[PDB]
Write a protein that binds this ligand. Structure first.
Ligand SMILES: [Mn+2]
Ligand SMILES: [Mn+2]
Ligand SMILES: [Mn+2]
Ligand SMILES: [Mn+2]
Lengths: 300, 6, 307
Protein backbone atom coordinates (compact mmCIF):
# COMPACT_ATOMS: atom_id res chain seq x y z
CA UNK A 1 0.00 0.00 0.00
CA UNK A 2 1.00 3.70 -0.18
CA UNK A 3 1.48 6.38 2.51
CA UNK A 4 -2.13 7.58 1.82
CA UNK A 5 -3.65 4.09 2.33
CA UNK A 6 -5.01 2.96 5.73
CA UNK A 7 -3.19 0.12 7.53
CA UNK A 8 -5.15 -1.58 10.31
CA UNK A 9 -2.46 -3.64 12.05
CA UNK A 10 -0.47 -1.63 14.60
CA UNK A 11 2.95 -3.10 13.89
CA UNK A 12 5.23 -3.54 12.12
CA UNK A 13 5.44 0.12 11.16
CA UNK A 14 5.72 0.85 7.41
CA UNK A 15 7.43 4.14 8.44
CA UNK A 16 9.52 3.19 11.50
CA UNK A 17 11.63 6.35 11.30
CA UNK A 18 8.64 8.19 12.82
CA UNK A 19 9.94 6.97 16.20
CA UNK A 20 13.19 8.95 15.83
CA UNK A 21 11.04 12.13 15.83
CA UNK A 22 8.67 11.02 18.62
CA UNK A 23 11.63 9.88 20.76
CA UNK A 24 13.28 13.28 20.25
CA UNK A 25 10.18 15.04 21.54
CA UNK A 26 9.98 12.60 24.45
CA UNK A 27 13.62 13.21 25.35
CA UNK A 28 13.20 16.97 25.05
CA UNK A 29 9.86 17.01 27.00
CA UNK A 30 9.26 20.19 29.02
CA UNK A 31 6.45 22.32 30.41
CA UNK A 32 6.48 26.08 31.09
CA UNK A 33 5.74 25.61 34.84
CA UNK A 34 9.35 24.39 35.17
CA UNK A 35 10.47 28.01 34.73
CA UNK A 36 9.87 31.17 36.78
CA UNK A 37 10.40 34.58 35.16
CA UNK A 38 10.61 36.93 38.20
CA UNK A 39 14.30 37.55 37.58
CA UNK A 40 13.59 38.24 33.87
CA UNK A 41 10.88 40.76 34.75
CA UNK A 42 13.37 42.59 37.06
CA UNK A 43 15.93 42.89 34.22
CA UNK A 44 13.26 43.97 31.78
CA UNK A 45 12.21 46.69 34.24
CA UNK A 46 15.64 47.86 35.36
CA UNK A 47 18.22 47.03 32.65
CA UNK A 48 16.65 47.21 29.19
CA UNK A 49 16.22 50.36 27.13
CA UNK A 50 12.92 51.26 25.47
CA UNK A 51 14.36 49.97 22.17
CA UNK A 52 15.22 46.65 23.82
CA UNK A 53 11.94 46.34 25.71
CA UNK A 54 10.04 46.88 22.47
CA UNK A 55 12.11 44.23 20.60
CA UNK A 56 11.44 41.74 23.43
CA UNK A 57 7.76 42.62 23.52
CA UNK A 58 7.13 42.60 19.80
CA UNK A 59 9.17 39.40 19.32
CA UNK A 60 6.97 37.68 21.90
CA UNK A 61 3.81 39.10 20.30
CA UNK A 62 4.97 37.76 16.94
CA UNK A 63 5.69 34.34 18.48
CA UNK A 64 2.28 34.33 20.20
CA UNK A 65 0.61 35.20 16.96
CA UNK A 66 1.61 31.71 15.76
CA UNK A 67 1.90 29.84 19.05
CA UNK A 68 -1.17 31.09 21.04
CA UNK A 69 -3.89 29.51 18.90
CA UNK A 70 -5.39 26.13 18.12
CA UNK A 71 -2.86 24.67 15.63
CA UNK A 72 -4.73 21.81 14.07
CA UNK A 73 -2.25 20.63 11.39
CA UNK A 74 -0.32 17.94 13.27
CA UNK A 75 -3.38 16.49 15.05
CA UNK A 76 -4.99 16.00 11.64
CA UNK A 77 -2.13 14.31 9.63
CA UNK A 78 -3.60 10.84 10.38
CA UNK A 79 -6.64 11.83 8.21
CA UNK A 80 -4.29 12.10 5.23
CA UNK A 81 -1.77 9.33 6.17
CA UNK A 82 -3.92 6.75 8.01
CA UNK A 83 -1.11 4.76 9.59
CA UNK A 84 -0.85 4.00 13.32
CA UNK A 85 2.69 5.56 13.34
CA UNK A 86 1.42 8.84 11.87
CA UNK A 87 -1.37 9.01 14.39
CA UNK A 88 1.55 8.68 16.84
CA UNK A 89 3.64 11.36 15.14
CA UNK A 90 0.58 13.63 14.81
CA UNK A 91 -0.55 13.23 18.42
CA UNK A 92 2.95 13.79 19.80
CA UNK A 93 3.44 17.01 17.82
CA UNK A 94 -0.14 18.21 18.57
CA UNK A 95 0.41 17.80 22.31
CA UNK A 96 3.67 19.58 21.90
CA UNK A 97 1.90 22.53 20.29
CA UNK A 98 -0.42 22.76 23.35
CA UNK A 99 2.60 22.99 25.63
CA UNK A 100 3.72 25.84 23.39
CA UNK A 101 0.40 27.74 23.50
CA UNK A 102 0.36 27.49 27.31
CA UNK A 103 3.98 28.70 27.52
CA UNK A 104 3.48 31.79 25.32
CA UNK A 105 0.07 32.58 26.88
CA UNK A 106 1.85 32.61 30.26
CA UNK A 107 4.63 34.89 28.96
CA UNK A 108 2.00 37.34 27.70
CA UNK A 109 0.25 37.30 31.16
CA UNK A 110 3.47 37.68 33.13
CA UNK A 111 4.80 40.57 31.03
CA UNK A 112 1.45 42.37 30.73
CA UNK A 113 0.85 42.13 26.97
CA UNK A 114 -2.57 40.57 26.85
CA UNK A 115 -4.26 43.83 25.68
CA UNK A 116 -1.70 44.38 22.90
CA UNK A 117 -2.09 40.75 21.76
CA UNK A 118 -5.87 41.17 21.46
CA UNK A 119 -5.28 44.29 19.30
CA UNK A 120 -2.44 42.79 17.25
CA UNK A 121 -4.45 42.92 14.00
CA UNK A 122 -4.10 46.74 14.23
CA UNK A 123 -0.51 46.28 13.05
CA UNK A 124 -0.38 46.36 9.23
CA UNK A 125 2.61 44.02 8.88
CA UNK A 126 0.85 41.50 11.14
CA UNK A 127 -2.20 41.52 8.84
CA UNK A 128 0.12 40.67 5.93
CA UNK A 129 1.47 37.84 8.08
CA UNK A 130 -2.07 36.55 8.73
CA UNK A 131 -2.67 36.50 4.93
CA UNK A 132 0.42 34.47 4.03
CA UNK A 133 -0.12 32.06 6.99
CA UNK A 134 -3.71 31.64 5.79
CA UNK A 135 -2.52 31.03 2.22
CA UNK A 136 -0.21 28.32 3.52
CA UNK A 137 -2.84 26.64 5.70
CA UNK A 138 -5.86 26.95 3.39
CA UNK A 139 -5.66 23.40 1.93
CA UNK A 140 -4.76 21.74 5.27
CA UNK A 141 -8.05 19.78 5.19
CA UNK A 142 -8.24 19.09 1.44
CA UNK A 143 -9.03 15.58 0.22
CA UNK A 144 -7.00 16.48 -2.85
CA UNK A 145 -3.67 14.85 -1.94
CA UNK A 146 -1.74 17.17 -4.28
CA UNK A 147 -3.28 20.31 -2.77
CA UNK A 148 -2.57 19.07 0.75
CA UNK A 149 1.04 18.21 -0.14
CA UNK A 150 1.68 21.88 -1.04
CA UNK A 151 0.18 22.84 2.35
CA UNK A 152 2.47 20.29 3.95
CA UNK A 153 5.58 21.57 2.16
CA UNK A 154 4.88 25.23 3.03
CA UNK A 155 3.84 24.43 6.63
CA UNK A 156 7.07 22.48 7.19
CA UNK A 157 9.62 24.71 5.46
CA UNK A 158 8.04 28.12 6.35
CA UNK A 159 5.81 27.95 9.40
CA UNK A 160 7.70 25.30 11.42
CA UNK A 161 11.19 25.91 10.09
CA UNK A 162 11.37 29.68 9.63
CA UNK A 163 8.44 31.98 10.53
CA UNK A 164 9.33 32.12 14.28
CA UNK A 165 13.09 31.73 14.13
CA UNK A 166 14.00 35.42 13.81
CA UNK A 167 12.02 36.08 17.04
CA UNK A 168 13.79 33.15 18.75
CA UNK A 169 17.10 34.56 17.69
CA UNK A 170 16.28 38.08 18.92
CA UNK A 171 15.29 36.79 22.37
CA UNK A 172 18.39 34.50 22.64
CA UNK A 173 20.75 37.40 21.74
CA UNK A 174 19.79 39.09 25.06
CA UNK A 175 20.94 36.09 27.05
CA UNK A 176 24.05 35.36 24.91
CA UNK A 177 25.47 38.91 24.79
CA UNK A 178 24.10 40.68 27.86
CA UNK A 179 23.16 37.84 30.23
CA UNK A 180 19.52 38.94 30.59
CA UNK A 181 16.20 37.09 30.11
CA UNK A 182 17.76 33.70 30.98
CA UNK A 183 14.40 32.04 31.73
CA UNK A 184 12.58 33.45 28.70
CA UNK A 185 15.58 32.08 26.75
CA UNK A 186 14.98 28.61 28.34
CA UNK A 187 11.42 28.60 26.93
CA UNK A 188 12.67 29.90 23.55
CA UNK A 189 15.46 27.34 23.24
CA UNK A 190 13.08 24.47 24.11
CA UNK A 191 10.51 25.73 21.63
CA UNK A 192 13.23 26.07 18.92
CA UNK A 193 14.29 22.42 19.43
CA UNK A 194 10.64 21.26 19.27
CA UNK A 195 9.96 23.27 16.14
CA UNK A 196 13.15 21.98 14.42
CA UNK A 197 11.97 18.44 15.19
CA UNK A 198 8.52 19.35 13.70
CA UNK A 199 10.05 20.81 10.51
CA UNK A 200 12.35 17.77 10.13
CA UNK A 201 9.36 15.46 10.65
CA UNK A 202 7.56 17.30 7.85
CA UNK A 203 10.64 17.03 5.58
CA UNK A 204 10.75 13.29 6.34
CA UNK A 205 7.11 12.91 5.29
CA UNK A 206 7.52 15.08 2.21
CA UNK A 207 10.40 12.94 0.97
CA UNK A 208 8.41 9.74 1.56
CA UNK A 209 5.66 11.22 -0.64
CA UNK A 210 8.32 12.11 -3.23
CA UNK A 211 9.57 8.47 -3.24
CA UNK A 212 6.01 7.11 -3.75
CA UNK A 213 4.45 9.84 -5.94
CA UNK A 214 7.29 11.69 -7.74
CA UNK A 215 4.61 12.99 -10.19
CA UNK A 216 3.10 15.20 -7.43
CA UNK A 217 6.30 17.28 -7.37
CA UNK A 218 5.66 18.87 -10.73
CA UNK A 219 6.72 22.19 -12.22
CA UNK A 220 3.53 23.99 -11.06
CA UNK A 221 3.95 22.79 -7.46
CA UNK A 222 7.63 23.78 -7.30
CA UNK A 223 6.91 27.22 -8.80
CA UNK A 224 4.03 27.85 -6.34
CA UNK A 225 6.25 26.90 -3.37
CA UNK A 226 9.10 29.18 -4.48
CA UNK A 227 6.88 32.21 -5.06
CA UNK A 228 5.01 31.75 -1.73
CA UNK A 229 8.34 31.50 0.08
CA UNK A 230 9.59 34.70 -1.62
CA UNK A 231 6.48 36.61 -0.58
CA UNK A 232 6.63 35.22 2.94
CA UNK A 233 10.32 36.12 3.44
CA UNK A 234 9.50 39.70 2.33
CA UNK A 235 6.73 39.78 4.96
CA UNK A 236 9.04 38.43 7.74
CA UNK A 237 11.62 41.06 6.80
CA UNK A 238 9.07 43.80 7.37
CA UNK A 239 8.13 42.15 10.68
CA UNK A 240 11.69 42.90 11.76
CA UNK A 241 11.10 46.64 11.16
CA UNK A 242 8.13 46.55 13.51
CA UNK A 243 9.99 44.51 16.14
CA UNK A 244 12.66 47.20 16.14
CA UNK A 245 10.16 50.08 15.73
CA UNK A 246 11.77 51.98 18.63
CA UNK A 247 15.34 51.66 17.34
CA UNK A 248 18.13 49.25 16.44
CA UNK A 249 19.62 47.27 19.30
CA UNK A 250 23.16 46.20 20.09
CA UNK A 251 22.72 42.45 20.63
CA UNK A 252 21.39 41.62 17.13
CA UNK A 253 21.04 43.21 13.64
CA UNK A 254 18.18 43.04 11.15
CA UNK A 255 20.44 42.34 8.10
CA UNK A 256 21.91 39.30 9.82
CA UNK A 257 18.41 38.11 10.74
CA UNK A 258 17.19 38.30 7.08
CA UNK A 259 20.24 36.27 5.87
CA UNK A 260 19.60 33.76 8.70
CA UNK A 261 16.03 33.24 7.49
CA UNK A 262 17.04 33.07 3.83
CA UNK A 263 19.71 30.53 4.63
CA UNK A 264 17.33 28.39 6.70
CA UNK A 265 14.84 28.30 3.82
CA UNK A 266 17.44 27.23 1.22
CA UNK A 267 18.70 24.40 3.44
CA UNK A 268 15.16 23.09 3.85
CA UNK A 269 14.51 23.34 0.09
CA UNK A 270 17.70 21.37 -0.61
CA UNK A 271 16.50 18.64 1.74
CA UNK A 272 13.34 18.12 -0.35
CA UNK A 273 15.04 18.48 -3.78
CA UNK A 274 13.76 21.93 -4.69
CA UNK A 275 16.08 24.62 -6.14
CA UNK A 276 17.62 27.03 -3.66
CA UNK A 277 16.13 30.58 -3.88
CA UNK A 278 18.60 32.96 -2.18
CA UNK A 279 22.05 31.30 -2.25
CA UNK A 280 23.38 33.13 0.83
CA UNK A 281 27.18 33.45 1.11
CA UNK A 282 29.09 31.80 3.96
CA UNK A 283 30.19 35.09 5.50
CA UNK A 284 26.58 36.32 5.59
CA UNK A 285 24.98 33.21 7.17
CA UNK A 286 27.90 32.74 9.61
CA UNK A 287 26.78 35.94 11.41
CA UNK A 288 24.05 34.00 13.31
CA UNK A 289 26.01 30.70 13.45
CA UNK A 290 25.91 31.14 17.23
CA UNK A 291 22.16 30.35 17.21
CA UNK A 292 22.51 26.57 17.43
CA UNK A 293 25.12 26.74 20.17
CA UNK A 294 23.00 29.16 22.21
CA UNK A 295 19.95 26.88 21.79
CA UNK A 296 22.06 23.93 23.05
CA UNK A 297 23.48 26.01 25.98
CA UNK A 298 20.00 27.21 27.12
CA UNK A 299 18.52 23.71 26.77
CA UNK A 300 19.69 23.30 30.38
CA UNK B 1 -21.33 29.05 15.66
CA UNK B 2 -17.97 30.90 15.89
CA UNK B 3 -17.43 33.65 18.49
CA UNK B 4 -15.07 35.55 20.79
CA UNK B 5 -15.12 36.04 24.55
CA UNK B 6 -12.34 38.26 26.00
CA UNK C 1 -26.53 33.85 41.36
CA UNK C 2 -27.99 35.51 38.21
CA UNK C 3 -28.34 32.88 35.46
CA UNK C 4 -27.66 34.07 31.92
CA UNK C 5 -30.61 34.36 29.55
CA UNK C 6 -28.44 32.91 26.79
CA UNK C 7 -24.88 31.70 26.33
CA UNK C 8 -22.67 29.74 23.97
CA UNK C 9 -22.62 25.97 24.54
CA UNK C 10 -19.75 23.46 24.83
CA UNK C 11 -20.53 22.54 21.17
CA UNK C 12 -19.92 26.05 19.86
CA UNK C 13 -16.56 27.28 18.69
CA UNK C 14 -14.78 29.90 20.79
CA UNK C 15 -11.99 31.41 18.67
CA UNK C 16 -9.89 33.34 21.19
CA UNK C 17 -7.39 31.22 23.07
CA UNK C 18 -7.79 32.58 26.63
CA UNK C 19 -9.49 32.93 29.02
CA UNK C 20 -10.62 29.31 29.15
CA UNK C 21 -14.40 28.79 29.50
CA UNK C 22 -13.52 25.41 31.05
CA UNK C 23 -10.35 26.13 33.11
CA UNK C 24 -10.58 22.84 35.02
CA UNK C 25 -9.26 21.08 31.87
CA UNK C 26 -5.80 22.08 33.18
CA UNK C 27 -6.19 19.86 36.28
CA UNK C 28 -6.30 16.84 33.96
CA UNK C 29 -3.53 17.93 31.53
CA UNK C 30 -1.22 18.84 34.46
CA UNK C 31 -1.81 15.47 36.13
CA UNK C 32 -0.78 13.73 32.88
CA UNK C 33 2.24 16.05 32.44
CA UNK C 34 3.32 15.32 36.01
CA UNK C 35 2.98 11.54 35.56
CA UNK C 36 4.81 11.62 32.21
CA UNK C 37 6.62 8.38 31.33
CA UNK C 38 7.81 6.24 28.40
CA UNK C 39 8.66 2.49 28.27
CA UNK C 40 12.29 3.16 27.16
CA UNK C 41 12.82 4.16 30.82
CA UNK C 42 12.42 0.48 31.72
CA UNK C 43 14.50 -2.70 31.40
CA UNK C 44 12.68 -6.01 31.80
CA UNK C 45 15.65 -8.45 32.21
CA UNK C 46 14.79 -9.24 35.85
CA UNK C 47 11.10 -9.83 34.93
CA UNK C 48 11.93 -12.31 32.17
CA UNK C 49 14.18 -14.28 34.55
CA UNK C 50 11.37 -14.25 37.16
CA UNK C 51 8.99 -15.43 34.40
CA UNK C 52 11.36 -18.15 33.18
CA UNK C 53 12.35 -19.65 36.52
CA UNK C 54 9.78 -18.85 39.17
CA UNK C 55 6.28 -18.68 37.64
CA UNK C 56 4.03 -21.73 37.19
CA UNK C 57 2.27 -22.43 33.88
CA UNK C 58 -0.98 -21.13 35.47
CA UNK C 59 0.86 -17.92 36.48
CA UNK C 60 2.66 -17.45 33.15
CA UNK C 61 -0.60 -17.90 31.32
CA UNK C 62 -2.35 -15.35 33.60
CA UNK C 63 0.43 -12.84 32.82
CA UNK C 64 0.41 -13.57 29.12
CA UNK C 65 -3.40 -13.37 28.75
CA UNK C 66 -3.73 -10.29 30.99
CA UNK C 67 -1.20 -8.60 28.71
CA UNK C 68 -2.88 -9.80 25.52
CA UNK C 69 -6.15 -8.41 26.89
CA UNK C 70 -4.57 -5.03 27.74
CA UNK C 71 -2.87 -4.98 24.32
CA UNK C 72 -6.20 -5.66 22.63
CA UNK C 73 -7.37 -2.18 23.71
CA UNK C 74 -3.96 -0.43 23.96
CA UNK C 75 -2.11 -1.64 20.89
CA UNK C 76 -4.37 0.09 18.40
CA UNK C 77 -5.11 3.50 16.96
CA UNK C 78 -7.33 5.04 19.64
CA UNK C 79 -8.73 8.11 17.93
CA UNK C 80 -11.40 9.23 20.49
CA UNK C 81 -9.41 11.75 22.51
CA UNK C 82 -7.79 13.20 19.36
CA UNK C 83 -11.35 13.68 17.99
CA UNK C 84 -13.10 15.49 20.92
CA UNK C 85 -12.22 19.01 19.64
CA UNK C 86 -14.33 18.12 16.57
CA UNK C 87 -17.31 18.02 18.97
CA UNK C 88 -16.27 20.61 21.63
CA UNK C 89 -14.44 23.28 19.53
CA UNK C 90 -12.68 25.04 22.38
CA UNK C 91 -8.92 25.67 22.66
CA UNK C 92 -8.97 23.92 26.09
CA UNK C 93 -10.51 20.80 24.64
CA UNK C 94 -7.98 20.64 21.83
CA UNK C 95 -5.40 20.69 24.65
CA UNK C 96 -7.14 17.97 26.68
CA UNK C 97 -7.74 15.95 23.48
CA UNK C 98 -4.12 16.25 22.32
CA UNK C 99 -2.75 15.57 25.75
CA UNK C 100 -4.75 12.30 26.19
CA UNK C 101 -4.16 11.24 22.55
CA UNK C 102 -0.35 11.53 22.92
CA UNK C 103 -0.64 9.60 26.19
CA UNK C 104 -2.48 6.76 24.38
CA UNK C 105 0.48 6.51 21.87
CA UNK C 106 2.92 6.19 24.80
CA UNK C 107 0.54 3.39 25.88
CA UNK C 108 0.49 1.62 22.52
CA UNK C 109 4.27 1.74 22.29
CA UNK C 110 4.62 0.42 25.88
CA UNK C 111 2.39 -2.66 25.39
CA UNK C 112 3.86 -3.28 21.91
CA UNK C 113 7.26 -3.46 23.68
CA UNK C 114 5.98 -5.94 26.32
CA UNK C 115 4.61 -8.17 23.57
CA UNK C 116 7.97 -8.27 21.77
CA UNK C 117 9.88 -8.71 25.04
CA UNK C 118 7.73 -11.61 26.26
CA UNK C 119 7.50 -13.26 22.83
CA UNK C 120 3.72 -12.85 22.32
CA UNK C 121 3.52 -11.18 18.88
CA UNK C 122 2.22 -14.37 17.24
CA UNK C 123 -0.46 -14.84 19.89
CA UNK C 124 -1.48 -11.20 19.58
CA UNK C 125 -1.88 -11.40 15.78
CA UNK C 126 -4.24 -14.37 16.19
CA UNK C 127 -6.08 -13.02 19.23
CA UNK C 128 -9.42 -13.00 17.40
CA UNK C 129 -9.28 -16.84 17.48
CA UNK C 130 -10.38 -16.52 21.12
CA UNK C 131 -14.21 -16.50 21.32
CA UNK C 132 -14.43 -14.27 24.38
CA UNK C 133 -12.17 -11.66 22.78
CA UNK C 134 -14.44 -11.54 19.69
CA UNK C 135 -17.31 -10.81 22.09
CA UNK C 136 -15.19 -8.12 23.73
CA UNK C 137 -14.63 -6.57 20.28
CA UNK C 138 -18.45 -6.55 19.87
CA UNK C 139 -19.20 -4.69 23.10
CA UNK C 140 -16.31 -2.30 22.36
CA UNK C 141 -17.68 -1.61 18.88
CA UNK C 142 -21.07 -0.71 20.44
CA UNK C 143 -19.48 1.79 22.80
CA UNK C 144 -17.49 3.29 19.92
CA UNK C 145 -20.21 3.34 17.21
CA UNK C 146 -21.38 6.98 17.77
CA UNK C 147 -17.85 8.35 18.44
CA UNK C 148 -17.90 10.36 15.19
CA UNK C 149 -21.65 11.15 15.25
CA UNK C 150 -22.81 14.67 14.41
CA UNK C 151 -25.86 13.89 16.58
CA UNK C 152 -24.79 15.32 19.93
CA UNK C 153 -27.07 13.18 22.14
CA UNK C 154 -25.71 9.97 20.63
CA UNK C 155 -22.11 11.21 20.84
CA UNK C 156 -22.72 12.04 24.50
CA UNK C 157 -23.75 8.37 24.93
CA UNK C 158 -20.54 7.19 23.29
CA UNK C 159 -18.60 9.46 25.66
CA UNK C 160 -20.38 8.12 28.78
CA UNK C 161 -19.69 4.52 27.83
CA UNK C 162 -16.19 5.36 26.63
CA UNK C 163 -15.37 6.95 30.00
CA UNK C 164 -17.05 4.54 32.45
CA UNK C 165 -16.30 1.31 30.57
CA UNK C 166 -13.27 1.58 28.28
CA UNK C 167 -11.21 4.07 30.31
CA UNK C 168 -12.36 3.29 33.83
CA UNK C 169 -13.06 -0.47 33.90
CA UNK C 170 -12.24 -2.62 30.85
CA UNK C 171 -8.49 -2.77 31.62
CA UNK C 172 -8.47 -2.62 35.39
CA UNK C 173 -8.87 -6.38 36.11
CA UNK C 174 -5.75 -7.02 34.03
CA UNK C 175 -3.92 -4.23 35.83
CA UNK C 176 -4.84 -5.75 39.19
CA UNK C 177 -3.72 -9.26 38.18
CA UNK C 178 -0.33 -8.08 37.00
CA UNK C 179 0.15 -5.91 40.07
CA UNK C 180 -0.76 -8.87 42.38
CA UNK C 181 2.46 -10.63 41.29
CA UNK C 182 4.55 -7.79 42.67
CA UNK C 183 2.43 -7.12 45.76
CA UNK C 184 2.18 -10.73 46.86
CA UNK C 185 5.32 -12.41 45.39
CA UNK C 186 7.79 -9.62 44.56
CA UNK C 187 8.01 -10.69 40.89
CA UNK C 188 7.53 -8.69 37.64
CA UNK C 189 8.44 -5.31 39.24
CA UNK C 190 9.23 -3.52 35.97
CA UNK C 191 6.12 -4.80 34.24
CA UNK C 192 4.20 -3.56 37.27
CA UNK C 193 5.78 -0.10 36.80
CA UNK C 194 4.38 0.10 33.27
CA UNK C 195 0.98 -1.11 34.55
CA UNK C 196 0.87 1.26 37.53
CA UNK C 197 1.73 4.19 35.25
CA UNK C 198 -0.96 3.16 32.72
CA UNK C 199 -3.53 2.80 35.57
CA UNK C 200 -2.79 6.36 36.71
CA UNK C 201 -3.18 7.61 33.15
CA UNK C 202 -6.42 5.76 32.52
CA UNK C 203 -7.97 7.05 35.75
CA UNK C 204 -7.20 10.62 34.66
CA UNK C 205 -8.78 9.94 31.22
CA UNK C 206 -11.92 8.55 32.85
CA UNK C 207 -12.20 11.55 35.24
CA UNK C 208 -11.66 13.96 32.35
CA UNK C 209 -14.47 12.17 30.52
CA UNK C 210 -16.63 12.44 33.65
CA UNK C 211 -15.93 16.17 33.91
CA UNK C 212 -17.10 16.66 30.32
CA UNK C 213 -20.27 14.58 30.88
CA UNK C 214 -21.08 16.69 33.97
CA UNK C 215 -20.62 19.95 32.00
CA UNK C 216 -23.05 18.62 29.35
CA UNK C 217 -25.42 17.82 32.29
CA UNK C 218 -25.43 21.48 33.35
CA UNK C 219 -25.87 22.91 29.86
CA UNK C 220 -28.26 20.32 28.41
CA UNK C 221 -30.06 18.64 31.33
CA UNK C 222 -32.73 17.39 28.85
CA UNK C 223 -30.12 14.95 27.46
CA UNK C 224 -30.13 12.65 30.54
CA UNK C 225 -33.60 11.28 29.76
CA UNK C 226 -35.21 7.97 30.68
CA UNK C 227 -34.30 6.00 27.54
CA UNK C 228 -30.70 7.23 27.53
CA UNK C 229 -30.04 6.36 31.19
CA UNK C 230 -31.59 2.90 30.59
CA UNK C 231 -29.56 2.44 27.36
CA UNK C 232 -26.41 3.03 29.47
CA UNK C 233 -27.47 0.74 32.32
CA UNK C 234 -28.04 -2.16 29.91
CA UNK C 235 -24.79 -1.75 27.95
CA UNK C 236 -22.82 -1.65 31.21
CA UNK C 237 -24.50 -4.83 32.47
CA UNK C 238 -23.65 -6.72 29.27
CA UNK C 239 -20.07 -5.37 29.20
CA UNK C 240 -19.36 -6.61 32.73
CA UNK C 241 -20.59 -10.08 31.63
CA UNK C 242 -18.01 -10.17 28.84
CA UNK C 243 -15.20 -8.98 31.16
CA UNK C 244 -16.12 -11.68 33.67
CA UNK C 245 -15.66 -14.23 30.95
CA UNK C 246 -12.37 -12.60 30.01
CA UNK C 247 -11.19 -13.64 33.50
CA UNK C 248 -12.09 -17.28 32.74
CA UNK C 249 -9.91 -17.16 29.66
CA UNK C 250 -7.05 -15.34 31.47
CA UNK C 251 -7.03 -18.11 34.12
CA UNK C 252 -7.57 -20.89 31.53
CA UNK C 253 -4.64 -22.95 32.94
CA UNK C 254 -6.12 -22.71 36.45
CA UNK C 255 -6.63 -20.35 39.35
CA UNK C 256 -3.59 -18.73 40.99
CA UNK C 257 -2.54 -17.73 44.50
CA UNK C 258 -2.08 -13.94 44.21
CA UNK C 259 -5.64 -13.07 43.08
CA UNK C 260 -9.17 -14.51 42.56
CA UNK C 261 -11.87 -14.06 39.90
CA UNK C 262 -14.70 -13.26 42.30
CA UNK C 263 -12.77 -10.48 43.97
CA UNK C 264 -11.95 -9.04 40.53
CA UNK C 265 -15.59 -9.16 39.40
CA UNK C 266 -16.74 -7.27 42.50
CA UNK C 267 -13.82 -4.86 41.96
CA UNK C 268 -15.13 -4.08 38.46
CA UNK C 269 -18.82 -3.86 39.49
CA UNK C 270 -17.86 -1.52 42.32
CA UNK C 271 -15.83 0.91 40.20
CA UNK C 272 -18.65 1.03 37.64
CA UNK C 273 -21.10 2.09 40.37
CA UNK C 274 -18.69 4.71 41.70
CA UNK C 275 -18.31 6.18 38.20
CA UNK C 276 -22.12 6.14 37.86
CA UNK C 277 -22.54 8.08 41.12
CA UNK C 278 -20.09 10.65 39.79
CA UNK C 279 -22.28 11.38 36.76
CA UNK C 280 -25.55 11.26 38.79
CA UNK C 281 -26.75 7.91 37.43
CA UNK C 282 -28.37 5.26 39.67
CA UNK C 283 -26.02 2.45 40.75
CA UNK C 284 -26.40 -0.99 39.09
CA UNK C 285 -24.72 -3.56 41.39
CA UNK C 286 -24.55 -2.23 44.98
CA UNK C 287 -21.67 -4.50 45.98
CA UNK C 288 -21.29 -5.07 49.77
CA UNK C 289 -19.83 -4.63 52.66
CA UNK C 290 -17.21 -6.36 52.65
CA UNK C 291 -16.56 -7.81 49.13
CA UNK C 292 -14.86 -4.89 47.22
CA UNK C 293 -12.25 -4.45 50.03
CA UNK C 294 -10.65 -7.67 48.83
CA UNK C 295 -8.99 -5.40 46.20
CA UNK C 296 -8.82 -2.17 48.24
CA UNK C 297 -5.07 -2.74 48.04
CA UNK C 298 -5.22 -1.82 44.31
CA UNK C 299 -4.71 1.96 44.67
CA UNK C 300 -1.98 1.56 47.32
CA UNK C 301 -0.09 -0.82 45.04
CA UNK C 302 -0.57 1.54 42.09
CA UNK C 303 0.77 4.46 44.16
CA UNK C 304 3.64 2.20 45.30
CA UNK C 305 4.69 0.91 41.84
CA UNK C 306 4.91 4.45 40.44
CA UNK C 307 8.13 5.06 42.45
MN1 LIG D 1 4.96 25.53 18.30
MN1 LIG E 1 5.45 23.14 15.49
MN1 LIG F 1 -4.41 3.71 27.30
MN1 LIG G 1 -7.13 6.18 28.01
Amino acid sequence: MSIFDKRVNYKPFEYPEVLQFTEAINKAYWVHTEVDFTADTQDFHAHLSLAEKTAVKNSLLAIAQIEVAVKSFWGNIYEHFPKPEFNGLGSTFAECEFRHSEAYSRLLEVLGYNDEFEKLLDVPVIRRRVDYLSNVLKDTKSQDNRKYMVSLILFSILIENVSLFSQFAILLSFTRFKGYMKNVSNIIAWTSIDEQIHANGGIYIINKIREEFPDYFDEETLALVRETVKDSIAVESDILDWIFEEGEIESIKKGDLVNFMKFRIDESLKQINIPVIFDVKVEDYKALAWFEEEVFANSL
Amino acid sequence: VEYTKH
